[PDB]
Amino acid sequence: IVTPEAISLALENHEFKPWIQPVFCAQTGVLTGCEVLVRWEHPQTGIIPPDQFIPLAESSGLIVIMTRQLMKQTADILMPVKHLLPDNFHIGINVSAGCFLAAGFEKECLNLVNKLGNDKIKLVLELTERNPIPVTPEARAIFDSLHQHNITFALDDFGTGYATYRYLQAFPVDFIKIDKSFVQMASVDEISGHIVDNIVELARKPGLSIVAEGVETQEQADLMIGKGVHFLQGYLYSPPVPGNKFISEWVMK
Amino acid sequence: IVTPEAISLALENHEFKPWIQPVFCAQTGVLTGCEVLVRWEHPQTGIIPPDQFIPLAESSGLIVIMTRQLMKQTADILMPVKHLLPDNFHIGINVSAGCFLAAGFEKECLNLVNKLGNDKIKLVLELTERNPIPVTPEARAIFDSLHQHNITFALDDFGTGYATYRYLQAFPVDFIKIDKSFVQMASVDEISGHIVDNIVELARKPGLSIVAEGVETQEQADLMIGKGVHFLQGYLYSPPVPGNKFISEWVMK
Ligand SMILES: OC[C@H]1CC[C@H](O)CC1
Ligand SMILES: OC[C@H]1CC[C@H](O)CC1
Ligand SMILES: [Mg+2]
Ligand SMILES: [Mg+2]
């Protein structure tokens, strides 16, 4: 029984942990960044997956607290090893409208960047497709302010939900992440491949970088690489893993 | 002011009228079809525009009645002149998920087509961006059934709302209508033109046709024509007009 009070208690007890999935250069296979995903480790019941708590976190507003804690915990995890990270190491944080609009959001982003090195790392706010940022002047002001501070944006799960051409028109973002439904169907159906080409063409004029999500097989990767995708992410390389294991597997060694 | 009961009463009092906007071949300027739009003429106070009633029509469910009436009235309006219509004359009807999934929908579409000539006209169900059809087997069955009956589909206001690549992947539609926000901004801003190019490239592989909406100036039209758009629609040619005036201006002369 997942309730707002159970989520609040779990936040106090720091049960929401940052699992980290590596991301790679499509050209060379080299580690270029990561995405931070949340896992609720309930001390008795075990893993409660995002599907069961994120929606309620969002409607209750608790998501703001959760995201703040994940950002803070990500800084703590990576700080001891920040000198071992490649240059321009990307850190992907999933951001909903509620977090984006919350007083003090910009400050939390700066704290993460300052702790880890203003110029060593690149913070990528991965804007969700489900609870899009509204298209308003105020939203654009926050967006522009963060950009002036060298923080960057992705449209996440592009091609699904509210992740439309309109968002690219309203917000000059830096990355587009292709939803896995297109990546994984591009070798199977008649349009999914064409959709990936379309996203590649879309990115080219403004000079955005593309990441293919959900890369599961080598043929999917080769296909994505061949179509001009810049970064790759998925279970072929690694699923998301706990922080200590992310450090141990992908940073050390 | 505007309530579900006022909408119900207005339906019974026939205050919702089908206005009709012509659509044209971009290459030649020739009449190829129309879109059926709704206007609420309140007897004392005047027009209540779609923006103020459609949402409440949709959430209340009354949209199903309204759309049914509009389809029926469009048949009545065009029947006397159907022999004067060009071959393959397109009739665009705006359809939300609620209408599409309602009992009796397919039947209403057939009645329209049979009254007007199975092979003279082409019914185009313009799927809305606000209230997308769910991506389910049952939805796809209704979609396929209608296709077998030579009824066609458009993704309306493509690039906005939920009108994403995913809808093209889930439903093999026949047309894409480009939202006016791209048509009218193409050559004011830095990406809108690029977005139209992208929609043109998107359509080409599966062989879909494109209509540019909101064509307001000659330079917008020339631009859309140059980029390979197939059909044009907007105030430059004509706003929507009452049926009798549609017939008198665009059919019977
Ligand atoms: O390392 C490439 C990065 C691109 C942006 C993404 O949001 C994170 C991974
Ligand atoms: O006349 C071309 C037609 C294209 C489909 C649209 O939904 C109606 C107009
Ligand atoms: Mg993400
Ligand atoms: Mg329409």
From Swiss-Prot, chains A, B:
Keywords: c-di-GMP, DNA-binding, Hydrolase, Magnesium, Manganese, Metal-binding, Transcription, Transcription regulation
Field pH dependence: Optimum pH is 9.35.
Regulation: Strongly inhibited by Ca(2+).
GO molecular function, one term: metal ion binding
Effect of G193S: Increases catalytic activity
Cofactors named for this entry: Mg(2+); Mn(2+)
Consequence the record notes for mutating S192W: Slow monomer-dimer exchange. Equilibrium largely on the monomeric side, in particular in the presence of substrate. Strong decrease in activity
Induction remarks: Autoregulated. Directly regulates its own expression in a c-di-GMP-dependent manner.
EC number(s) per entry: 3.1.4.52
Catalytic EC class: hydrolase
Function, as annotated: Acts both as an enzyme and as a c-di-GMP sensor to couple transcriptional activity to the c-di-GMP status of the cell. Phosphodiesterase (PDE) that catalyzes the hydrolysis of cyclic-di-GMP (c-di-GMP) to 5'-pGpG. Also acts as a transcription factor to control its own expression.
Identification of the protein by name: Cyclic di-GMP phosphodiesterase PdeL
Species this protein is from: Escherichia coli (strain K12)
Organism classification: Bacteria, Pseudomonadati, Pseudomonadota, Gammaproteobacteria, Enterobacterales
Gene transcribed to yield this protein: pdeL
Included range, full protein: 107 to 359 of 362
